[PDB]
């Protein structure tokens, strides 16, 4: 558990330091020196937008990709005694790509809204640009993570489908209903991301 | 001040990609080879 | 200078006749069905592929963004 | 040298590719003395159309030199595969 | 006027609601699907009864959608911040609560399928327990809906 | 008249497909996915052209298309020597067996590369490039712009009154040297991939009607084919029509705030019809947008549940697990409706791979052979020798082999998943007659 | 002046280097001698 | 007269109360359902009694709903900050305390349900201990209600 | 007029696109080589076929090279920041996408090599599953390309 | 006029390229050497062929040396910062890419070398795969060379 | 004109060059020594040949010693910072590169010596592999020297 | 005119040198004593010679004492900071280098002493290897003495 111990030690020290610094700023009655509004305003909306775009596409493929090999290994292993599996159980992978597609479409549609500002001093500049920037960030994150977890779900379910079908061909069709729910969960994230960027403007 | 816009934004992107690197490296390190081969 | 009407007529007739009349002018061997399939499938896919390429470039919204050296060269090339 | 007839044959094919493609490149510039417009121009490019004609001739010369080297390479590889 | 960045928190709320509810549904769904497939190999006659846990998971996913949509439609540029904080709370409230519920959905459905696999009479009991998980998802949704209207 | 399997001698027969020296390879890549249902429509006669075409779009490279054919010809020229010999190398045998497939794939790749006018990133100048009249550019208040040009590019305006006219054949070569080819040509290929993908799907569906006739299943068209094709036409064919309309309806005169087909398509599905702020493609479009989506929904009940519903009606009157049949049909409906949306995305591989290849060709040329050129005569000539040799090596290693293989697989994917799944369904048995196979032994 | 620069540099430079030492020490601390050959008899 | 962002603390309170309580009830429910499913296979007649730990868990969930709603009703824009700290404290107090109680509810039910099947005389002892877990949950509710009105 | 540091984000994009893609392709290569070495002993005739997962991984590495070079050739000093973030997004997008692709390649290939040797009918399925992962990696490339003109 | 401390990034590049490349080669060398020691005791005639992984590992190390030196010779005091960002990108690009290749070398070397003793027909297959890892390392060098002079 | 704190970096370099290389050499020494002890019980006749990895380990430690001294003899209070960064990079380059080599030395020594105990023909192959580790160590030294004199 | 708290760094040096040196010697001592205790049961006649690893390990703590005091002898209030950095670097150099040596001593002592009883001919090889670890520790001292006096 050498790596888990490293991850934990970093995690604990990271937040423990934040607690000490935060409380100290309070204790020493600093003039709101740690100003969240300052961080949000100085941080260029361009980063937030491009980050959300990269997340929307990058997280979604990670999900799909995760599930693909989950079900790939189960299919390949079981298929040694039940080669019929490849005929029908490949649809589990189609669902996995489909989860990536949901995010991919949004990633492009969102990025199509990215524009320059020709802006400098945030003071009274880009009021709408900050809203659109944060919204695009959220919408990208929304769909990215939603597809990420969907892809894992579909992989786990598809694995059971392959193992089941190897022993009873009648089970395949009924199980398909579970993966459909998995796909629907990802679509829900798409609906929200669409709404979040439904009324935005850049530039 | 302790941080500038530049420094902070740089740290934010650095950590995001550092997490990606960590994820990749994690699974790469946790990679084993075979103890023995099945047959001749 | 060119119009679009003429390119369309020339290549539409070419591929159209092949896909429509072509099957009438085919060997009678055992591969006749394959050759007829080839003639028709080829004409349709090839025509549509080309047609988009030439049609899509009509009524353009913008021209190319060229490097300085090329822009000058064209003055005395085209 | 033998070098292996399988590798001599590969050299012959590359040599033929070289001579054919390099001569073609020189011709295209010589005729359109052009869309590619890659003769290795200077950055300080002046209003002198003759500079494009001159550089294009330079490209043809350089290309034919490269072809000449492929002619020598193909000749050598030819004898190797024939003797092997 | 309406300060900048005020919409930031409301966006995080709308995103959090959907993502955490998706997490809950995904866990409960994957766990339920695992148990169902394992049972159906041994006896397929219980498959239809064993489906409900999967819908139960989907409910958490919807819960999250309802609030995330409510907020996402409410999001604008000129937000008075107070409204954004209400949105932040509503988003987290339903998402994180649905996550807890979805976990319970997963664990209870998976164990429930194995239980019924051995003794079908457990069906009604297992559904009643999953009803408590649905109630936990509802409570989260209730609070989130209340906050968004303040 | 479609090709179907032969009769074999009231049990399910194996599927017998007669092939020859050329078509056998195509049948095998079909069989690799599965053995078709007895009396099923054989997809192979259409694969012979369809697959090379999809490759040619994925591999639309004029220069490599030639090299690809030459490789196939080499194998064919040794056909007699390879057949009457030992071939323990299975990879060589496989590509040999596919030698006639490869040749055709190259043939179409040349066709598509020629229209794209890309031969190792080289354009094909037919003396027809009249896109713009540079002499008039300077007249339009651009005097000595080549002085400032030292630090600028400057994009050639549309409709200045002096530009216009299409390129005689394919894309105007001038875009091959532009800095914004990446918007002009990328957009065209995007739209092309969508149009071709939708057409290919509609073709596959149309074939299902013939299969439904052959097996005398009127119900499979009354609640199947008809509502399914209505769904696809109303949504996906409409989109295609709009794409051509945009190209032919609007000129640069409306380039600012020009209607975006992506936004109108999204607003269509969502019934979002703003009064103003966004220009419409044509008057009344909002009414059409609403009409088509509603109709698409109206066809769904037939495809979703009426098939098992009428089967129950007819069954009980003649006298069938009604619940199970509802499950089957509901899943089928979801797969068809959702798959059409997903399948459309699948055909974006035509754009994605065509672009990816174009990026490899442009970059491999620019960062390898271009740098080998120099104003110094002898050094340039000798450098081109060594640099080109490496360049040709990279073109083979990266594009002719690896990418050609990738495009092979991706086009084959489209055939198996998106095309065949519209009509080529079910399974059959391997046809294994008595034959005198042991000739060498 | 420019505190944020020296601050940023020194903090993250010394932190990364300190961790490299900590991890290296961990890896050395827990070196596996094999616990075989003669160890089983001494154990 | 009041500072900005003062409402931030309050909304975190209302959310935290519900989320932690759902996490507590969810844990206890998940563990209880697992034990119930495993036990009831051997002793199906106990299915209608072994549900109780799950109800106990639902109580933790209500505890959270009550405070979260009570805080939500007290959320305004012109909050005096002082009141917001009290609301945050009330939210955390009941939520985190309910979380601890739900943990015990889970572990005690899991062991108790199986122990009861192997020992019917344990039923009374199991309930009594669960009563103690409910008392632990209430203590948090009591303080939270005191703070939210202070 | 150019915000300083504007070029910093851009340069990181070109690097990440190459590094993360190499990590993915290397992982897939390492996994495949392990399965290939174990399989090939008993069925050396399959050694040539077993390379395919590795070639596919190599494609992922190229995907990354294309973006890294495209960005590198697009770097200047007076970068307007807007362009820089587009390049950083392109790098990260293809990087993580290729990384995930490579992992799927490796994991599937390892199982595929063993499965095919035991059951040659699985050969096509092995290629198919790897093919879908390669298609997913392509998306990562394309989105990186799209951003270059936005 | 040039920003201060601008040399920091370029210097880190030169060192990073060398260190990460040594890490990659060191891993592949150590892992291959382990397989060599375990293998060649049974098949000493292969001792002069099983070194190849290790040689190819040295290539990764050179790739790093070439860039690390290229960067170091490119540094001055009055650096315009832009150039330094490029130097760090080039350093990391080749270093971390070589690191990824080093893992491939190590894993493939071990599996291949031991497999070769079991099946000598694997010898060529091992080289081909290791060749792919070397190609992956090359890509990093190419990009680093492009950036370092950009 | 000299930035204060500037000398801090150069001093850390001189230390790092020794500390990291010392960690590597120590690992290699301990790892090889363990294998040597195992060998000697089986057969002491090789005890004077298996020491080589340990002697080689020392060479790597010297690499670090040399640079650390060269940096220390190059430290001043009136440092121009540019030189300070070069010294930090040089120290890290040799230290971290020697560190990687040190681990490589230990791993291959242990495996080589243990194998040689059974197969004396392994000795020559062992030496070549150890030679590669020495080459990896040199590369770090070379760059560090180039930077420190830049 | 000197910076405030400039002694802070030099003081950390004097402490760090002693602490890390004790850490190294303690580790080697603990491991050496463990091997001695296990070994001497079989061959009590070696209990005396087997102490050497522990005696050698003490040399590390001595090294640390020497530098820690050497630094302390040079601690004043009016330190020019530069001198403080030198003291901190020297302290860390010898301390952490001694730590590396401590690991080597401990690991080699354990295996060596136990091996010696199994193979009396190992004694000389054990001493030689321990000598290399002592040389590695001295390198730290050498750098610290040169650096702290610069």
How far is I41 from chain J, CA to nearest CA, in Å?
A: 5
- The tokens for E18 are 């959907």
Distance (Å) of CA A109 to CA A52, A104, F260, H15, L40 = 12, 9, 12, 33, 76
Expressed as residue numbers, the domain containing D70 is 1-84
Q: Is F91 on the interface with I (CB under 8 A)?
A: yes
Chain K interface, best mutation among J5, J19, J28, by max K CB count within 10 A: J19
The span from the CA of A132 to the CA of A196, in Å, is 9
- Tokens standing for residue F78: 């040794």
Q: Of the candidates A119, A131, A150, which has an alpha carbon nearest to the alpha carbon of residue A198?
A: A131
Q: Domain residue spans in chain G?
A: 1-43
SS3 L76: coil
Distance from C-alpha of F305 to C-alpha of J10, rounded to nearest angstrom: 67
Structure tokens at E129: 């327990």
CA dist L136 and L94 (Å) reads 10
Tokens found for residue F261? 């087909």
Contacts of L144 by beta carbon, 8 Å cutoff, 6+ apart = L17, L67, L70, L90, L91, L93, L94
Among F89, F50, F52, F94, which residue's Cα sits nearest to residue F69?
F52
Q: Which residues does chain L have within 8 Å of residue G13's beta carbon, measured at their own beta carbons?
A: none
Residue E95 Cα distances to E28, E64, E76, E98, H55, angstroms? 14, 6, 21, 5, 23
Whether the Cβ atoms of residue H67 and residue H138 lie closer than 8 Å to each other: no
Contact residues for H142 (Cβ-Cβ < 8 A; gap 6+): none
Q: Is G8 on the interface with B (CB under 8 A)?
A: yes
- With b for 16 or more beta-carbon neighbours within 10 A and e for fewer, the K66-75 pattern comes to bbbbbbbebb
Residue F222: CB partners within 8 Å, gap ≥ 6?
A: F302
Q: How far apart are the first and last CA of chain B?
A: 69
Nearest to F328 among A98, A112, A173 (CB): A173
Q: Is D82 within 8 Å of chain F by CB?
A: no
Using left for φ > 0, alpha for ψ between -120 and 50, and beta otherwise, residue A133 falls in alpha
Give the distance from residue A25's alpha carbon to the nearest chain F alpha carbon, in angstroms. Answer: 49
* Buried b / exposed e along G1-40 (16+ C-beta atoms within 10 A): eeeebbebbeeebeeebeebbeebbeebeebebeeebbbe
CA–CA gap between residue G25 and residue K20 (Å, rounded): 10
| Integer Cα distance of I60 and I104 in angstroms | 11
Nearest chain F Cα to D48, which residue? F146
- Residue F14 phi/psi, 5-degree rounding, is -70, 160
Beta bridge partner(s), residue F15: F430
Helix or strand holding residue E120 (H, E):
none
Q: Measured between CA atoms, how close is G43 to chain K, in angstroms?
A: 15
Contacts of F146 in chain D (CB under 8 A): 45, 47
Nearest chain G Cα to K12, which residue?
A: G14
Q: Is some CB atom of chain I closer than 8 A to the CB atom of F94?
A: no
Cβ–Cβ contact E64 with A under 8 A: yes
Cα–Cα distance, K122 to F160 (Å, whole number):
80
Tokens describing residue I66 = 């294309």
Resolution (angstroms) stands at 4.4
- What burial letters (b/e) apply to L103-140, b meaning 16+ CB within 10 Å? bbbbbbbbbbbbbbbbbeebbebbbbbbebbbbbbbbb
Q: Is F80 exposed, middle or buried (0-12, 13-18, 19+ CB in 10 A)?
A: exposed
Give residue H75's Cα distance to chain centre. Answer: 22
Residue I36 C-beta-side C-alpha neighbours within 13 Å:
35
Contacts of G21 in chain L (CB under 8 A): 96
DSSP character for B36? S
Residues 20-49 in I contacting A (C-alpha not used; CB under 8 Å): none
Short-list K11, K1, K15, CA closest to K85: K11
Considering only CB atoms, L38 lies closest to which of G28, G33, G42, namely: G42
Chain C: nearest CA to F215, how far in angstroms?
23
Task: Quote the radius of gyration of chain B (alpha carbons, Å).
Answer: 20
Q: Check CB contact under 8 Å for E8 and A134.
A: yes
> Is residue J110 within 8 Å of residue J33, measured between CB atoms?
no
**Cα–Cα dist A18/A21, whole Å:** 5
Mapped onto helix, strand or coil, the DSSP state of residue C4 is coil
Using CB atoms, pick whichever of L99, L100, L115 lies closest to residue G38. Answer: L115
Verify whether the Cβ–Cβ distance C76 to D34 is below 8 Å: no
Reference H20, options H75, H63, H77, H83; nearest CA is H63
| Cα dihedral: E8, E10, E16, E17 (round 10) | -170
For residue J4, the chain G residues in CB contact (below 8 A) are 2, 5
Number of other residues whose CB lies within 10 A of the CB of residue C10:
11
The alpha carbon of residue G20 is apart from the nearest alpha carbon of chain A, in Å, by: 12
Tokens representing G36 are 């075989």
Kindly list the residues from chain G whose CB atom is less than 8 angstroms away from the CB atom of residue B2. Answer: 3-4, 7
Using a 10 angstrom Cβ sphere, with 0-12 exposed, 13-18 middle and 19 or more buried, the burial of residue C47 is middle
Written as six digits, the tokens of A96 are 């996995």
- The values of phi and psi at residue C65, to 5°, are -100, 110
- SS3 for F15? strand
CB A162, CB A75: distance < 8 Å: yes
Inter-chain touch K68–L143, beta carbons under 8 Å? yes
Say if residues H49 and H130 touch (Cβ distance below 8 Å).
Answer: no
Write out the two tokens for K95: 């230290």
Report residue L96 as tokens.
């952490």
Q: Is B31–J107 a contact, with Cβ atoms under 8 angstroms apart?
A: yes
Cα F15 to its chain centre, rounded Å, is 29
Q: Which helix (H) or strand (E) covers residue E71, if one does?
A: helix E52-74
Please tell me the distance in Å from B9's CA to the nearest CA on chain I: 9
**Integer angstrom CA distances of residue E108 from A181, F147, H28, H36, H102:** 18, 76, 11, 9, 16
- Given a contact cutoff of 8 angstroms between Cβ atoms, the answer to whether K41 and L118 are in contact is yes
The CB density around residue A24, as the number of other CB atoms within 10 Å, is: 10
Q: Where are the alpha helices (DSSP H) in A28-171?
A: 36-42, 45-78, 85-88, 91-111, 127-167
- DSSP-based three-state secondary structure for F14: strand
Provide the number of structural domains found in chain D. Answer: 1
Cα dihedral sign, H106-H108-H110-H112: negative
Chain position carrying tokens 């970059």: F363
F266/A109 touch (CB, cutoff 8 Å), yes or no? yes
Set of chain B residues whose Cβ sits within 8 Å of the Cβ of G8: 3, 7
> Which residue, among L100, L87, L105, L101, has the nearest Cα to L143 in the 3D structure?
L87
Reading phi first (left if > 0) and then psi (alpha if -120 to 50, else beta), residue J79 is in beta
What burial class does residue A193 get, using C-beta atoms within 10 Å of its C-beta: 0-12 exposed, 13-18 middle, 19+ buried? buried
Task: Report how far residue F298's alpha carbon sits from residue F310's, in angstroms, rounded to the nearest whole number.
Answer: 18
Closest CA to J11 of J63, J81, J66: J81
Which of E15, E22, E41 is facing A164, going by the closest CB pair? E41
CA atoms of J101 and F60, how far apart (whole Å)? 32
- CA K60 from chain center: how many Å? 3
Which residues does residue F155 pair with via DSSP β-bridges, in sequence order? C65
3-state secondary structure (DSSP) of residue A92 = helix
Could you tell me which of F399, F405, F419, F418 has the C-alpha nearest to residue F113? F399
Interface C:I, ≥3 CB–CB pairs < 8 Å: no
Contact with chain K for residue L142, Cβ under 8 A: yes
CA-based nearest residue to G37, from K39, L107, L40: K39
Say which of F180, F183, F409 has its CB closest to residue I127. Answer: F409
CB-based contact, K122 to chain L, within 8 Å: no
CA angle D59, D61, D65 (to 5 degrees): 115
| Cα→Cα distances J2→B20, H34, I10, J5, K9, Å | 33, 67, 20, 9, 21
Say if residue A14 is exposed, middle or buried (CB neighbours under 10 Å; 0-12, 13-18, 19+): exposed
| Rounded-to-integer distance, Cα A59 and Cα A141, Å | 8
Q: Which of I6, I96, I118 to mutate to test the interface with B (most CBs of B within 10 A)?
A: I96
φ, ψ of residue L31 in degrees (nearest 5): -70, -40
Contact C56 F192 (CB under 8 A): yes
First to last CA, chain I: 20
G positions 1-40 inside 8 Å of A (CB): 23, 26, 30
- Those of residues 402-431 in F touching chain A at CB distance below 8 A are 417, 427
CB H49 within 8 A of CB E123: no
Tell which phi-psi region holds residue F282, choosing left (phi > 0), alpha (psi between -120 and 50) or beta: beta
> Rounded to an integer, what distance in angstroms lies between the CA atom of residue F408 and that of residue D40?
37
> How far off is chain E from A114, nearest CA to CA, in Å?
17
Angle at G31 between CA G26 and CA G33, to 5 degrees: 165
Beta bridge partners of F430: F15
Query: B24 and I27 in contact by Cβ < 8 A?
Result: yes
Whether K123 has its CB under 8 Å from any CB of chain J: the answer is no
How many CA atoms does the CB half-sphere of F374 hold within 13 Å? 14
Contact present, L and K (at least 3 Cβ pairs less than 8 Å): yes
CA distance I31 to I54: 9
> CA nearest L101 in G: which residue?
G28
Q: Nearest-CA residue of chain B relative to J107?
A: B33
Residue in chain F nearest A104 by alpha carbon: F345
* F150/D69 touch (CB, cutoff 8 Å), yes or no: no
């Amino acid at each position: 558990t050498g790596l888990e111990l490293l991850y934990l030690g970093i995690f604990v020290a990271f937040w423990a330091c934040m607690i000490v610094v935060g409380i100290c700023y309070t204790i020493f009655d600093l003039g709101f020196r740690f100003d969240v509004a300052w961080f949000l305003t100085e941080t260029s909306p361009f980063m937030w937008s491009n980050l959300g775009i990269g997340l929307a596409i990058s997280l979604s493929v990670v999900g799909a990709a995760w599930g693909i090999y989950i079900t790939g290994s189960s299919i390949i292993g079981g298929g040694v005694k039940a080669p019929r599996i490849k005929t029908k159980n490949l649809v589990s992978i189609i669902f996995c790509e489909a989860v990536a597609i949901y995010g991919i479409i949004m990633a492009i549609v969102i990025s199509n809204m990215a524009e320059p500002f020709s802006a400098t001093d945030p003071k009274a500049i880009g009021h709408r640009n900050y809203h659109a920037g944060y919204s695009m960030f959220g919408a990208g994150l929304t769909v990215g993570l939603s597809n990420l977890f969907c892809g894992v779900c579909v992989g786990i379910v598809g694995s059971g489908a392959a193992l089941a079908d190897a022993q009873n061909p009648s089970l395949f069709v009924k199980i398909l209903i579970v993966e459909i729910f998995g796909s629907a969960i990802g679509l829900f994230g798409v609906i929200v991301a669409i709404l979040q960027t439904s009324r935005v403007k850049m530039g | 001040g302790f941080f500038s816009p530049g420094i902070w934004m740089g740290l934010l992107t650095t950590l995001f990609m550092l997490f990606i690197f960590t994820y990749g490296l994690h699974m790469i390190l946790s990679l084993k080879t075979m103890d023995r081969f099945d047959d001749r | 200078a060119h119009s679009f009407a003429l390119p369309v007529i020339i290549f539409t007739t070419f591929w159209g006749l092949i896909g429509i009349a072509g099957p009438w002018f085919v060997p009678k061997g055992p591969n006749r069905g394959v050759i007829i399939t080839m003639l028709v499938a080829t004409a349709v896919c090839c025509y549509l592929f080309w047609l988009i390429a030439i049609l899509a470039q009509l009524n353009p919204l913008f021209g190319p963004q060229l490097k300085n050296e090329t822009i000058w060269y064209v003055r005395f090339l085209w | 040298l033998c070098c292996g007839p399988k590798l001599a044959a590969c050299g012959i094919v590359l040599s033929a590719w070289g001579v054919i493609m390099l001569i073609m490149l020189g011709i295209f510039f010589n005729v359109h003395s052009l869309i590619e417009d890659v003769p290795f121009t200077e950055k300080d490019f002046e209003n002198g159309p003759q500079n494009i004609y001159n550089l294009y001739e330079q490209v043809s010369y350089n290309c034919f030199i490269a072809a000449g080297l492929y002619l020598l390479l193909g000749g050598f590889s030819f004898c190797q595969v024939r003797l092997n | 006027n309406n300060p900048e960045y005020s919409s930031f928190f409301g966006v995080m709320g709308a995103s959090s609601a959907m993502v955490f509810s998706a997490m809950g549904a995904a866990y409960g769904t994957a766990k339920s699907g695992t148990g169902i497939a394992a049972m159906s190999v041994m006896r397929p006659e219980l498959i239809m009864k064993s489906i409900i846990p999967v819908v139960m998971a989907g409910i958490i996913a919807i819960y999250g959608l309802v609030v995330a949509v409510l907020i996402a439609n409410s999001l604008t540029d000129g937000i008075t911040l107070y409204r954004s904080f209400l949105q932040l709370g509503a988003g987290l409230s339903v998402g994180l609560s649905g996550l807890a519920a979805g976990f319970a959905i997963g664990i209870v459905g998976d164990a429930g399928v194995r239980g019924t696999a051995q003794q079908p009479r457990l069906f009604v009991g297992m559904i009643l327990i999953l009803i408590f998980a649905e109630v936990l998802g509802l409570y989260g949704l209730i609070v989130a809906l209340i906050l968004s209207t303040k | 008249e479609l090709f179907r399997s032969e009769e074999m001698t009231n049990q399910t027969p194996p599927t017998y497909n007669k092939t020859n020296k050329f078509t056998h390879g195509f049948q095998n890549i079909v069989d690799a996915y599965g053995i078709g249902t007895y009396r099923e429509i054989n997809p192979a006669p259409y694969t012979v052209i369809t697959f090379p075409f999809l490759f040619a779009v994925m591999f639309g490279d004029f220069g490599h298309g030639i090299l690809m054919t030459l490789f196939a010809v080499w194998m064919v020229l040794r056909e007699s020597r390879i057949l009457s010999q030992k071939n323990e190398n299975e990879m060589f045998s496989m590509v040999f067996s596919g030698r006639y497939i490869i040749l055709l794939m190259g043939l179409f790749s040349i066709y598509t590369g020629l229209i794209y006018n890309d031969c190792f990133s080289k354009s094909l100048n037919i003396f027809g490039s009249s896109w713009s009249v540079r002499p008039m550019f300077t007249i339009g208040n651009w005097t000595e712009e080549t002085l400032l040009g030292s630090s600028v590019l400057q994009l050639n305006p549309a409709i200045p009154g002096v530009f216009g006219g299409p390129y005689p054949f394919g894309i105007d070569p001038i875009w091959n040297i532009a800095t914004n080819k990446l918007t002009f040509l990328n957009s065209f290929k995007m739209k092309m991939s969508v149009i071709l993908g939708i057409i290919h799907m509609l073709f596959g569906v149309s074939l299902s009607l013939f299969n439904h006739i052959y097996f005398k299943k009127p119900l499979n068209i009354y609640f199947g084919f008809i509502p399914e094709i209505i769904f696809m036409s109303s949504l996906f064919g409409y989109l295609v029509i709009l794409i051509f309309y945009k190209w032919t309806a609007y000129d640069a005169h409306s380039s600012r705030n020009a209607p975006s087909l992506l936004i109108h398509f999204i607003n269509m599905f969502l019934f979002s019809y703003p009064e103003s702020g966004n220009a419409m493609l044509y008057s009344g479009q909002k009414g059409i947008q609403c009409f088509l989506i509603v109709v698409a929904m109206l066809c769904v009940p037939w495809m979703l549940l009426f098939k098992p519903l009428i089967l129950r009606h007819q069954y009980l009157r003649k006298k069938f697990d009604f619940g199970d049949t509802m499950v089957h049909q509901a899943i089928h409906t979801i797969e068809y409706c959702l798959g059409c949306i997903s399948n459309t995305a699948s055909y974006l591989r035509l754009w994605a791979l065509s672009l990816a290849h174009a990026q490899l060709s442009e970059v491999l040329w620019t960062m390898v052979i271009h740098i080998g050129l120099h104003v110094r005569s002898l050094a340039g000539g000798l450098g081109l020798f060594f640099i080109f040799a490496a360049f040709a090596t990279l073109t083979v290693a990266i594009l002719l082999i690896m990418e050609g293989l990738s495009a092979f697989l991706h086009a084959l994917r489209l055939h198996w998943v998106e095309f065949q799944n519209k009509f080529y369904t079910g399974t059959g048995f391997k046809f294994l007659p008595f034959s005198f196979e042991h000739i060498r032994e | 002046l420019e505190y944020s620069v020296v601050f940023n540099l020194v903090l993250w430079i010394m932190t990364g280097l300190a961790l490299a030492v900590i991890i290296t020490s961990y890896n050395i601390w827990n070196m596996d001698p094999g616990y075989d050959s003669i160890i089983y008899r001494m154990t």
